[PDB]
Amino acid sequence: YTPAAAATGTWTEEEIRHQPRAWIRSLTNIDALRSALNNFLEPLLRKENLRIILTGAGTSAFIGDIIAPWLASHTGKNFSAVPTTDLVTNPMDYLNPAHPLLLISFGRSGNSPESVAAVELANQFVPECYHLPITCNEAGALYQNAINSDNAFALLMPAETHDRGFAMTSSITTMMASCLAVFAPETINSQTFRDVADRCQAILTSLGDFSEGVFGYAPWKRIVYLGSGGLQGAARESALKVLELTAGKLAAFYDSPTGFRHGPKSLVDDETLVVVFVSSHPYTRQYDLDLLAELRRDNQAMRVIAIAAESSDIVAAGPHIILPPSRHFIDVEQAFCFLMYAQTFALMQSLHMGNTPDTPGVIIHPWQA
Amino acid sequence: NYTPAAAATGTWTEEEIRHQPRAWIRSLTNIDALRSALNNFLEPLLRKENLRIILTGAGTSAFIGDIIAPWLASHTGKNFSAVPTTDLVTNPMDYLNPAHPLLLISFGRSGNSPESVAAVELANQFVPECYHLPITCNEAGALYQNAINSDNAFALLMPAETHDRGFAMTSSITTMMASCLAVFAPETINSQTFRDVADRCQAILTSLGDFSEGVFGYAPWKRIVYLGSGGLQGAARESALKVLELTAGKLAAFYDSPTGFRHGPKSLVDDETLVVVFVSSHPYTRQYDLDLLAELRRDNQAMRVIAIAAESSDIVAAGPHIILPPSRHFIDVEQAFCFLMYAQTFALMQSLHMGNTPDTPGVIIHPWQA
């Protein structure tokens, strides 16, 4: 997984390119920590009333949006996603004193004040409270606070994932892969996830030096990413990347294909790029493809791009990207592949407009006065 | 009682906005009449420790659960959550848990949205012990009719005037929302207490006169962002969608929470952007809203920053602002109704101002069994 040279000279490009290698590094770390993790988590997961909340701010909030439903379904446990920004402003709406809680806290720096504030609020509100921070900065407040507790097991990501770029890349993907591997090791582990790393390395290789812009370049003023279920979380992250790296010059939006029909589709104009992240689950994929057919037929957008594992007549009919050949991926695995395109697209839009992509607040109030 | 002023735009949307306070009290007084039937249906369900309660709808109807599910969860201590029908239909396996009983609260104006009916069928297919409470505006719709035809269901019909003729839902959404709150939290939200909300929203509408001033005005903004904390983010989302719908996309619209806004999305603020902040009435929560407002005011980069709040303060008064009519203290789910009055009427007048016709400004269902 050796990265090619970062010809743009940005940290962001380096951080995109070092992702496949970072992912496998993280999962081999989890293998080394597996007994310790099981000894911490197994007694918790045996509590039938356990709530597990995945929490982060900004990009870190989207990890939960992508994986929490899959984890709930897969494990049969009570996994949900609540951003740290909602926990901090409205703790009473989300923290239930009547059940035990395991709070999975994500942080690239670990220094957003909301990260430690949410942990403290959880401890205040929930009598039987446990923590698994997953973080990229050993020196961060979030990790430092956790080592200073006995209800916490903090998991450090590989050092290179402490992204220096303003926009998170390897931090989000590595934390997401790590969370998946912690709770679903039978499915996502240091062996199976090599297929995901290999395919994402192939995606990056397929894009060469990135100079052709991934989706190209055009005077679009609006971008919309669409994905079903948890892939909507990937669409949200993809939109935020565009927005951050273009300093808001390109307006960005996200939705699910089916949700998009209920009003939001009015945003599509002849200066709009629409990108569809097509599900690999055939039942779900039908809905993605029906919407793709509609968007192609509508003739409103500047460009409609389908990104899919499988080529089909509607996918191939207009602008499209077929993922490199691989085994069947489930949608949480596909999320990594889609993000490779969205990250690289956003980087190159930023550069093309002459921006500096690496460089393109909150006061915590106590619950008790 | 709550008699609307004349709808001088000649639009169904204006008529539907103005008849909201009256419709709310009509619905809650109906619930009073149905209370003992409701209680007979619901009390045995709510006694089930492991019950999941899902609030579901599409589009605007999805945002009801976004506004009220967390409050309902915390207020009642029951397992309330919101999942849009659009997610239930595409990814049922990710949301419908066969191991627990389910009560599905289905919102639908027509009751005929293919996704509404599909979500009901999928919930029945996936969840062995499944119950339904559709809240709907159409007596002849599938949601209502299927429910009354089955023993696992109890359907609640909204007042007839709330079957909105306008493309953009107004009285349908607010009346369904008030009804849902009244069903599950009648000790707090009821045909008595909610009269203060209807009264205040009637005062808001009166304060806007014939609406010709356009509410926030007619400046040449190109982007609008609504911000609200917690469940008010759902109100912000509905507010954004109304603008987008009624202007046929011409005004780009965004939503977020005040604290969420700092982590990237703030980059969207430019000198053609209007930012509207729905300030919490909760004394903890509002501190965060006001710190963010202060930051946006200090930045001075938006075309306009408008705070809407129950109480003025230096921060709120240091730029464009609207203070709500005087009333008793409202909780945030009550406030949502007040904020929506401004958002709906703003969107309607933006639409008309640009020469659009606001009243008039699809999905295939596939079987889970292939």
XYZ file of C-alpha atoms in Angstrom:
739
model
C 0.000 0.000 0.000
C 2.926 2.360 -0.612
C 1.540 5.778 -1.577
C 2.557 7.444 -4.820
C 4.244 10.841 -4.488
C 1.967 13.723 -3.512
C 2.597 15.982 -6.533
C 0.292 18.755 -5.177
C 2.638 19.177 -2.188
C -0.291 19.186 0.258
C -0.711 17.283 3.484
C -4.276 16.538 2.327
C -3.045 14.617 -0.728
C -0.546 12.686 1.384
C -3.313 11.895 3.867
C -5.687 10.643 1.141
C -2.949 8.478 -0.381
C -1.767 6.857 2.873
C -5.246 5.585 3.744
C -5.112 1.930 2.604
C -1.837 1.432 4.482
C -3.187 3.223 7.570
C -6.314 1.018 7.603
C -4.363 -2.246 7.681
C -1.952 -0.787 10.294
C -4.924 0.050 12.506
C -6.522 -3.403 12.153
C -3.265 -5.220 12.903
C -3.078 -2.985 16.047
C -6.581 -4.156 16.964
C -5.386 -7.763 16.537
C -2.608 -7.091 19.079
C -5.182 -5.444 21.427
C -7.906 -8.015 20.880
C -7.783 -9.781 24.275
C -7.656 -6.452 26.123
C -10.580 -5.111 24.062
C -12.632 -8.288 24.597
C -11.935 -8.237 28.359
C -13.192 -4.655 28.493
C -16.162 -5.032 26.079
C -17.454 -8.588 26.577
C -18.911 -7.940 30.097
C -20.594 -4.762 28.763
C -22.094 -6.346 25.652
C -23.653 -9.039 27.899
C -25.899 -6.350 29.477
C -29.141 -6.741 27.534
C -30.180 -3.112 28.276
C -26.852 -1.587 27.180
C -27.110 1.472 24.922
C -24.110 2.111 22.650
C -23.835 5.599 21.230
C -21.376 6.575 18.516
C -20.511 10.255 18.855
C -18.371 12.801 17.082
C -18.449 16.396 15.829
C -18.479 17.452 12.138
C -16.923 14.777 9.942
C -16.488 12.529 13.000
C -20.298 12.555 13.462
C -20.720 10.935 10.035
C -18.964 7.682 11.054
C -21.984 6.852 13.188
C -24.385 7.911 10.444
C -22.710 5.396 8.083
C -22.175 2.410 10.422
C -24.497 2.537 13.464
C -27.566 0.962 11.762
C -25.474 -1.798 10.205
C -23.834 -2.474 13.560
C -27.252 -2.563 15.318
C -28.665 -4.961 12.710
C -25.569 -7.132 12.499
C -25.007 -7.533 16.273
C -28.585 -7.243 17.488
C -27.345 -4.663 20.041
C -28.559 -1.113 20.700
C -26.128 0.933 18.536
C -27.100 4.454 17.574
C -25.362 7.670 16.421
C -25.708 11.053 18.157
C -23.316 13.893 17.359
C -21.259 15.334 20.206
C -22.701 18.708 19.149
C -26.211 17.443 20.076
C -25.035 15.668 23.272
C -23.422 18.911 24.457
C -26.414 21.228 23.802
C -29.261 18.765 24.617
C -27.837 16.063 26.878
C -31.216 15.425 28.522
C -32.711 14.417 25.158
C -30.203 11.597 24.498
C -28.558 10.364 27.695
C -30.773 7.881 29.559
C -30.002 7.426 33.299
C -32.117 4.221 33.353
C -29.746 2.087 31.241
C -26.029 1.470 31.089
C -24.238 3.360 28.325
C -21.152 2.688 26.258
C -20.083 5.910 24.554
C -17.864 5.488 21.538
C -16.189 8.900 21.104
C -14.379 9.792 17.846
C -11.864 12.604 17.555
C -9.089 13.393 15.070
C -7.411 15.932 17.417
C -9.364 14.887 20.507
C -9.298 18.653 21.249
C -12.780 19.820 20.150
C -14.209 21.017 23.475
C -17.417 19.109 22.703
C -15.581 15.759 22.800
C -14.541 15.950 26.471
C -17.753 17.835 27.325
C -19.880 14.918 25.956
C -17.872 12.354 27.927
C -18.354 14.428 31.113
C -22.060 14.878 30.435
C -22.471 11.128 29.858
C -20.744 10.459 33.218
C -22.964 13.015 34.947
C -26.252 11.758 33.439
C -25.739 7.979 33.255
C -24.844 6.184 36.500
C -23.464 3.103 34.768
C -21.345 4.676 31.999
C -18.384 3.314 29.993
C -16.226 4.795 27.267
C -14.357 3.654 24.182
C -12.741 6.697 22.659
C -11.281 6.083 19.226
C -8.862 8.923 18.459
C -5.871 9.966 16.300
C -3.983 12.171 18.779
C -2.412 10.580 21.875
C -1.815 14.092 23.222
C -5.441 15.136 22.712
C -7.801 16.060 25.498
C -10.110 13.121 24.687
C -7.379 10.476 25.046
C -5.726 12.222 27.975
C -9.075 12.409 29.828
C -9.681 8.662 29.223
C -6.321 7.361 30.486
C -7.227 9.387 33.576
C -10.454 7.220 34.096
C -11.269 3.573 35.003
C -14.510 3.228 32.968
C -12.661 3.892 29.666
C -10.604 2.002 27.065
C -9.015 4.412 24.590
C -7.923 3.159 21.182
C -5.194 5.115 19.381
C -5.121 5.231 15.580
C -1.816 5.032 13.680
C 0.224 8.203 14.095
C -0.014 9.264 10.417
C -3.826 9.545 10.657
C -3.563 12.626 12.829
C -4.393 14.609 9.691
C -2.658 17.964 9.300
C -5.016 18.958 6.503
C -8.012 21.012 7.717
C -10.289 18.511 6.003
C -10.268 15.032 7.610
C -9.402 12.122 5.326
C -7.353 9.269 6.812
C -8.611 10.142 10.323
C -12.294 9.465 9.480
C -11.676 6.363 7.373
C -9.239 4.792 9.793
C -11.522 5.441 12.814
C -14.524 3.986 10.923
C -12.621 0.853 9.862
C -11.366 0.479 13.457
C -14.849 0.754 14.975
C -16.217 -1.802 12.509
C -13.334 -4.209 13.368
C -13.829 -3.799 17.123
C -17.504 -4.770 17.079
C -17.779 -7.004 13.994
C -14.382 -8.817 13.825
C -15.979 -11.892 12.210
C -16.819 -9.678 9.184
C -14.391 -6.732 9.225
C -10.866 -7.782 10.227
C -7.200 -7.512 9.224
C -7.697 -10.207 6.571
C -11.088 -9.329 4.972
C -10.373 -5.602 5.031
C -7.255 -6.104 2.920
C -9.729 -6.494 0.038
C -11.097 -3.019 0.841
C -7.602 -1.526 1.183
C -6.566 -3.220 -2.127
C -9.594 -1.847 -3.999
C -9.134 1.677 -2.601
C -5.425 1.550 -3.526
C -6.594 0.549 -7.057
C -9.075 3.483 -7.080
C -6.310 5.906 -6.123
C -3.952 4.369 -8.700
C -6.711 4.630 -11.353
C -6.868 8.386 -10.725
C -3.128 8.888 -11.468
C -1.764 12.257 -10.347
C -5.373 13.474 -9.810
C -4.911 16.255 -12.429
C -8.055 15.315 -14.414
C -10.181 16.208 -11.409
C -11.965 12.867 -10.806
C -15.398 14.087 -12.014
C -13.621 16.659 -14.175
C -13.912 20.411 -13.984
C -16.898 22.521 -14.959
C -18.645 25.738 -13.926
C -21.041 23.876 -11.609
C -22.209 25.924 -8.624
C -24.012 23.140 -6.757
C -23.044 19.555 -5.981
C -25.345 16.886 -4.551
C -24.275 13.494 -3.306
C -26.915 10.762 -2.908
C -26.780 7.419 -1.135
C -29.298 5.035 0.461
C -29.333 4.088 4.132
C -25.898 4.523 5.727
C -24.468 5.618 2.401
C -26.346 8.868 2.989
C -23.711 9.412 5.718
C -21.011 8.944 3.107
C -22.868 11.457 0.880
C -22.963 13.947 3.781
C -19.201 13.626 4.369
C -18.583 13.959 0.616
C -20.649 17.169 0.529
C -18.904 18.616 3.562
C -15.476 17.947 1.991
C -16.451 19.963 -1.150
C -17.812 22.735 0.979
C -14.749 22.965 3.298
C -12.113 22.726 0.572
C -13.749 25.234 -1.769
C -14.327 27.705 1.117
C -18.039 27.459 0.364
C -17.698 28.511 -3.257
C -19.371 25.298 -4.448
C -22.651 24.799 -2.600
C -22.990 21.154 -1.517
C -25.967 19.022 -0.565
C -26.726 15.430 0.387
C -29.707 13.116 0.557
C -30.904 9.597 -0.068
C -32.132 8.823 -3.602
C -35.678 8.203 -2.402
C -35.647 11.160 0.074
C -34.452 13.447 -2.734
C -37.784 13.134 -4.561
C -39.764 14.690 -1.695
C -38.804 18.325 -2.347
C -34.977 18.532 -2.366
C -34.775 17.670 -6.074
C -35.962 21.219 -6.772
C -32.347 22.273 -6.082
C -31.136 20.563 -9.300
C -30.358 23.159 -11.994
C -28.190 23.310 -15.120
C -25.224 24.266 -12.917
C -25.679 21.206 -10.663
C -23.532 18.034 -10.497
C -25.289 15.011 -9.031
C -23.290 12.001 -7.850
C -25.052 8.732 -6.964
C -23.339 6.178 -4.687
C -25.070 2.989 -5.881
C -25.765 0.309 -3.253
C -24.305 -3.197 -3.666
C -27.395 -4.687 -1.991
C -29.600 -5.654 -4.921
C -32.896 -4.839 -3.150
C -31.670 -1.326 -2.198
C -29.868 -0.833 -5.527
C -33.197 -1.038 -7.375
C -34.289 2.222 -5.718
C -30.934 3.913 -6.511
C -31.186 2.887 -10.134
C -34.834 3.999 -10.487
C -33.812 7.445 -9.244
C -30.753 7.481 -11.530
C -33.102 6.783 -14.512
C -35.283 9.705 -13.396
C -32.325 12.122 -13.060
C -30.994 11.137 -16.473
C -34.481 11.608 -17.971
C -35.102 14.961 -16.190
C -32.428 16.873 -18.173
C -32.115 19.480 -15.422
C -28.609 18.807 -14.078
C -25.256 19.843 -15.570
C -23.952 16.286 -15.023
C -25.278 13.074 -13.395
C -22.581 10.548 -12.316
C -23.269 7.017 -11.150
C -20.579 5.228 -9.137
C -21.237 1.476 -8.938
C -19.634 -1.959 -8.556
C -21.782 -3.369 -11.294
C -22.355 -1.818 -14.669
C -25.950 -1.923 -15.857
C -27.711 -0.230 -18.742
C -28.860 2.790 -16.728
C -25.480 3.075 -14.995
C -23.543 2.840 -18.288
C -25.952 5.096 -20.248
C -24.341 8.313 -19.085
C -21.470 9.545 -16.938
C -20.279 6.738 -14.695
C -17.454 5.170 -12.751
C -17.246 1.420 -12.281
C -15.378 0.406 -9.139
C -12.294 -1.765 -9.642
C -13.081 -5.458 -9.776
C -13.357 -7.180 -6.387
C -15.339 -9.586 -4.270
C -18.811 -8.508 -3.245
C -18.630 -5.626 -0.711
C -21.384 -4.746 1.731
C -22.388 -1.093 1.885
C -20.220 -0.166 4.922
C -17.228 -1.527 2.940
C -18.322 0.352 -0.195
C -18.388 3.565 1.812
C -14.563 3.550 1.843
C -14.477 3.264 -1.980
C -16.960 6.116 -2.507
C -15.035 8.381 -0.180
C -11.834 7.955 -2.219
C -13.554 9.697 -5.131
C -15.239 12.376 -3.002
C -12.023 13.284 -1.131
C -9.907 13.496 -4.290
C -12.633 15.426 -6.104
C -12.802 18.011 -3.313
C -8.976 18.340 -3.125
C -8.734 19.036 -6.884
C -11.663 21.495 -6.933
C -9.873 23.444 -4.220
C -6.606 23.472 -6.183
C -8.255 24.251 -9.525
C -9.862 27.374 -8.014
C -6.480 28.466 -6.638
C -7.246 27.696 -2.992
C -4.800 26.261 -0.425
C -6.518 22.973 0.507
C -4.607 22.339 3.747
C -5.897 25.712 4.977
C -8.910 26.490 2.705
C -15.055 28.985 18.843
C -17.213 26.840 21.126
C -17.567 27.677 24.799
C -18.531 24.784 27.092
C -21.127 25.747 29.731
C -21.527 23.573 32.817
C -24.766 21.672 33.333
C -24.414 22.575 37.028
C -23.888 26.273 37.748
C -61.877 31.107 17.596
C -58.577 31.612 15.744
C -60.410 32.988 12.718
C -57.990 33.479 9.824
C -57.599 36.842 8.103
C -58.383 36.868 4.379
C -55.865 35.057 2.153
C -55.022 38.104 -0.026
C -52.418 36.222 -2.121
C -55.254 34.020 -3.413
C -53.111 30.924 -2.724
C -54.116 27.683 -1.013
C -50.735 27.832 0.765
C -51.617 31.123 2.479
C -55.047 29.787 3.467
C -53.384 26.676 4.884
C -50.808 28.687 6.829
C -53.451 30.955 8.350
C -55.857 28.152 9.453
C -53.161 26.370 11.510
C -53.940 27.652 15.054
C -57.608 26.746 14.587
C -56.766 23.345 13.096
C -54.427 22.517 16.019
C -57.136 23.035 18.631
C -59.702 21.186 16.490
C -57.370 18.193 16.343
C -56.589 18.197 20.112
C -60.276 18.548 21.027
C -60.928 15.530 18.738
C -58.209 13.599 20.584
C -60.105 14.477 23.813
C -63.168 12.788 22.309
C -61.066 9.731 21.282
C -58.980 9.616 24.478
C -60.477 6.518 26.065
C -60.265 4.547 22.759
C -56.650 5.750 22.318
C -55.812 4.766 25.856
C -57.360 1.297 25.390
C -55.178 0.749 22.336
C -51.950 2.282 23.598
C -51.751 1.522 27.316
C -51.223 -2.245 26.859
C -48.469 -1.511 24.328
C -46.697 1.134 26.362
C -46.517 -1.299 29.303
C -44.176 -3.496 27.183
C -40.653 -2.795 28.506
C -38.982 -3.718 25.226
C -41.330 -1.756 22.885
C -39.688 0.267 20.110
C -41.673 3.245 18.843
C -40.686 4.558 15.410
C -41.993 7.827 13.992
C -41.935 7.628 10.200
C -42.798 9.871 7.242
C -41.351 11.056 3.912
C -40.028 14.562 3.155
C -41.595 17.173 5.453
C -43.445 14.364 7.283
C -40.065 12.838 8.181
C -39.073 16.032 9.996
C -41.851 15.616 12.583
C -39.919 12.777 14.234
C -36.714 14.811 13.864
C -38.290 17.582 15.958
C -40.144 15.512 18.592
C -38.749 11.923 18.910
C -35.866 12.800 21.266
C -38.062 14.941 23.516
C -40.703 12.195 23.550
C -38.024 9.611 24.428
C -36.732 11.656 27.379
C -40.124 12.936 28.525
C -41.733 9.454 28.600
C -38.666 7.242 29.159
C -39.853 5.047 26.265
C -37.891 3.986 23.194
C -38.966 6.681 20.683
C -36.950 7.245 17.501
C -37.469 8.691 14.016
C -36.697 6.854 10.745
C -37.904 8.316 7.454
C -40.158 6.087 5.366
C -37.652 6.548 2.561
C -35.010 4.707 4.698
C -37.454 2.001 5.854
C -38.366 1.227 2.253
C -34.771 1.040 0.875
C -32.995 -0.492 3.909
C -35.676 -2.194 6.099
C -33.168 -4.675 7.557
C -31.111 -1.831 9.039
C -34.012 -0.289 11.018
C -36.719 -2.895 11.770
C -35.817 -5.158 14.661
C -37.516 -8.575 14.648
C -36.547 -9.219 18.305
C -38.719 -6.506 19.918
C -42.297 -5.337 19.623
C -42.784 -2.260 17.439
C -45.298 0.568 17.379
C -45.017 2.376 14.037
C -46.352 5.931 13.967
C -46.905 6.664 10.255
C -47.401 10.278 9.140
C -48.974 10.926 5.726
C -51.003 13.815 4.361
C -52.660 11.721 1.603
C -52.083 8.324 3.232
C -51.404 7.139 -0.303
C -47.623 7.789 -0.693
C -46.268 4.462 -2.006
C -43.518 4.691 0.640
C -46.066 5.147 3.445
C -47.906 1.933 2.557
C -44.666 0.097 1.776
C -43.197 1.045 5.200
C -46.289 -0.346 6.968
C -46.083 -3.635 5.003
C -42.346 -3.970 5.617
C -42.768 -3.358 9.363
C -45.456 -6.086 9.453
C -43.225 -8.450 7.418
C -40.093 -7.856 9.543
C -41.474 -7.466 13.089
C -43.573 -10.317 14.472
C -45.291 -8.158 17.106
C -46.100 -4.991 15.202
C -48.659 -2.279 15.937
C -49.585 0.866 13.989
C -50.821 4.364 14.747
C -51.148 6.231 11.465
C -51.655 9.992 11.810
C -53.100 11.121 8.512
C -55.156 13.850 6.768
C -57.152 11.661 4.311
C -60.021 9.442 5.476
C -60.013 7.581 2.135
C -56.221 6.977 2.065
C -54.566 3.589 2.428
C -52.940 4.474 5.772
C -56.300 5.250 7.340
C -58.295 2.484 5.625
C -55.735 -0.311 6.136
C -55.480 0.641 9.815
C -59.202 0.598 10.544
C -59.353 -2.787 8.753
C -56.774 -4.357 11.144
C -56.700 -5.178 14.866
C -53.025 -4.170 15.314
C -53.727 -0.548 14.274
C -55.496 2.593 15.474
C -55.687 5.467 13.006
C -56.037 9.087 13.914
C -57.619 11.377 11.326
C -56.601 15.063 11.187
C -59.188 17.829 10.626
C -60.387 18.004 7.020
C -58.856 21.431 6.291
C -55.372 20.045 6.957
C -55.418 17.866 3.793
C -53.313 20.653 2.253
C -53.990 21.490 -1.412
C -50.658 23.374 -1.654
C -47.659 21.397 -2.937
C -45.742 22.429 0.189
C -47.193 20.983 3.416
C -48.027 23.520 6.139
C -51.120 22.784 8.286
C -50.814 19.016 7.617
C -47.330 18.806 9.162
C -47.986 21.127 12.143
C -51.338 19.497 12.975
C -49.879 15.983 12.776
C -46.993 17.097 14.984
C -49.252 18.655 17.655
C -51.474 15.560 17.549
C -48.541 13.166 18.080
C -47.282 15.222 21.040
C -50.830 15.250 22.513
C -51.241 11.505 22.110
C -48.039 10.621 24.005
C -47.577 13.565 26.396
C -51.143 14.673 27.251
C -50.120 15.841 30.715
C -47.982 18.523 28.981
C -49.424 18.989 25.506
C -53.191 19.043 25.495
C -56.236 20.933 24.284
C -55.821 23.322 27.197
C -52.051 23.969 27.351
C -51.720 24.046 23.549
C -54.160 26.961 23.322
C -51.210 29.132 24.458
C -49.267 27.874 21.413
C -52.207 28.425 19.052
C -52.706 31.888 20.627
C -49.053 32.842 20.153
C -48.904 31.568 16.583
C -52.142 33.474 15.808
C -50.391 36.596 17.238
C -47.343 35.914 15.027
C -49.485 35.669 11.909
C -51.368 38.839 12.921
C -48.032 40.605 13.491
C -47.090 39.871 9.863
C -50.200 41.648 8.516
C -51.062 40.682 4.907
C -47.503 39.268 4.574
C -46.586 41.742 1.821
C -43.382 42.810 3.656
C -42.022 39.285 3.062
C -41.250 38.487 6.755
C -37.438 38.643 6.630
C -37.711 40.869 3.498
C -36.750 40.803 -0.186
C -32.953 41.290 -0.204
C -31.014 39.630 -3.029
C -29.771 36.668 -0.965
C -28.719 33.519 -2.856
C -28.379 31.205 0.169
C -30.423 30.730 3.268
C -29.322 28.795 6.326
C -31.587 27.880 9.224
C -29.987 26.870 12.548
C -31.561 25.206 15.591
C -30.236 23.057 18.439
C -31.440 19.551 19.251
C -34.900 18.924 17.833
C -35.104 22.494 16.497
C -32.642 21.345 13.867
C -35.655 19.446 12.438
C -37.587 22.745 12.352
C -34.594 24.306 10.565
C -34.649 21.415 8.075
C -38.355 21.884 7.330
C -37.785 25.647 7.028
C -34.956 25.102 4.551
C -37.015 22.634 2.478
C -39.961 25.079 2.251
C -37.682 27.792 0.755
C -36.195 25.349 -1.640
C -39.580 23.962 -2.755
C -41.472 27.217 -3.108
C -38.625 29.012 -4.945
C -38.158 26.024 -7.313
C -34.573 25.761 -6.120
C -33.654 29.347 -6.915
C -32.747 30.101 -3.319
C -30.267 27.486 -2.093
C -31.256 26.413 1.443
C -29.246 24.713 4.213
C -29.838 23.635 7.806
C -27.746 22.672 10.815
C -27.415 23.015 14.545
C -25.563 26.090 15.848
C -22.743 23.957 17.334
C -22.636 21.596 14.302
C -22.321 24.650 12.024
C -18.810 25.444 13.298
C -17.330 22.119 12.119
C -17.140 22.902 8.355
C -20.594 24.042 7.196
C -19.962 27.667 8.242
C -17.841 27.942 5.096
C -21.077 28.263 3.176
C -21.707 31.715 4.714
C -21.007 34.420 2.116
C -22.171 38.006 1.538
C -25.295 36.751 -0.278
C -26.325 34.460 2.626
C -29.170 34.951 5.092
C -28.705 33.073 8.359
C -31.721 32.554 10.630
C -31.195 31.280 14.173
C -34.023 29.643 16.092
C -32.946 30.386 19.687
C -33.716 27.733 22.317
C -35.960 28.544 25.286
C -34.042 25.994 27.316
C -31.735 27.875 29.700
C -28.793 25.464 29.189
C -29.189 24.939 25.423
C -29.679 28.608 24.552
C -26.251 29.550 25.893
C -24.758 27.656 22.953
C -27.194 29.253 20.479
C -26.285 32.718 21.693
C -22.488 32.061 21.556
C -22.858 30.988 17.932
C -25.097 34.013 17.170
C -22.400 36.263 18.694
C -19.792 34.669 16.449
C -21.900 35.134 13.286
C -22.607 38.767 14.258
C -18.937 39.457 14.965
C -17.826 37.759 11.707
C -20.062 40.158 9.793
C -19.800 38.062 6.625
C -23.426 37.070 5.964
C -25.730 39.427 4.061
C -27.989 39.212 7.126
C -28.141 37.316 10.450
C -31.611 37.131 12.061
C -32.188 35.765 15.568
C -35.711 34.669 16.468
C -36.150 34.427 20.265
C -38.602 34.598 23.168
C -36.235 36.855 25.172
C -34.082 39.646 23.850
C -30.484 39.981 25.051
C -27.522 42.066 24.027
C -26.396 39.437 21.530
C -29.905 39.000 20.093
C -30.406 42.818 19.927
C -26.950 43.526 18.327
C -28.425 42.881 14.847
C -31.627 41.858 12.977
C -33.980 39.987 15.269
C -37.570 39.030 15.938
C -38.871 38.680 19.508
C -41.810 36.310 19.754
C -45.128 37.660 21.131
C -45.300 37.539 24.931
C -46.467 34.269 26.425
C -45.743 31.803 29.188
C -42.468 29.835 28.998
C -42.579 27.411 26.059
C -40.464 24.280 25.759
C -38.615 23.728 22.470
C -41.171 21.382 20.908
C -43.787 24.149 21.529
C -41.439 26.804 20.083
C -41.027 24.772 16.881
C -44.592 25.839 15.947
C -43.741 29.543 16.405
C -40.536 29.335 14.323
C -42.358 27.495 11.547
C -44.881 30.376 11.226
C -42.003 32.654 10.151
C -40.351 30.030 7.897
C -43.596 29.113 6.073
C -44.694 32.683 5.474
C -41.150 33.683 4.419
C -41.009 30.909 1.810
C -44.498 31.731 0.451
C -43.580 35.436 -0.042
C -40.175 34.705 -1.554
C -41.998 32.442 -4.044
C -44.561 35.086 -4.928
C -41.944 37.871 -5.058
C -39.987 35.996 -7.716
C -43.137 35.460 -9.828
C -43.607 31.782 -9.009
C -46.926 30.039 -8.327
C -46.462 28.677 -4.780
C -49.356 26.162 -4.814
C -47.652 24.508 -7.841
C -44.117 25.977 -7.891
C -41.770 8.911 -9.123
C -40.923 6.085 -6.765
C -41.479 2.459 -7.725
C -41.959 0.041 -4.824
C -40.155 -3.270 -5.092
C -41.061 -6.304 -3.042
C -38.692 -7.535 -0.335
C -39.534 -11.051 -1.520
C -37.952 -11.144 -5.009
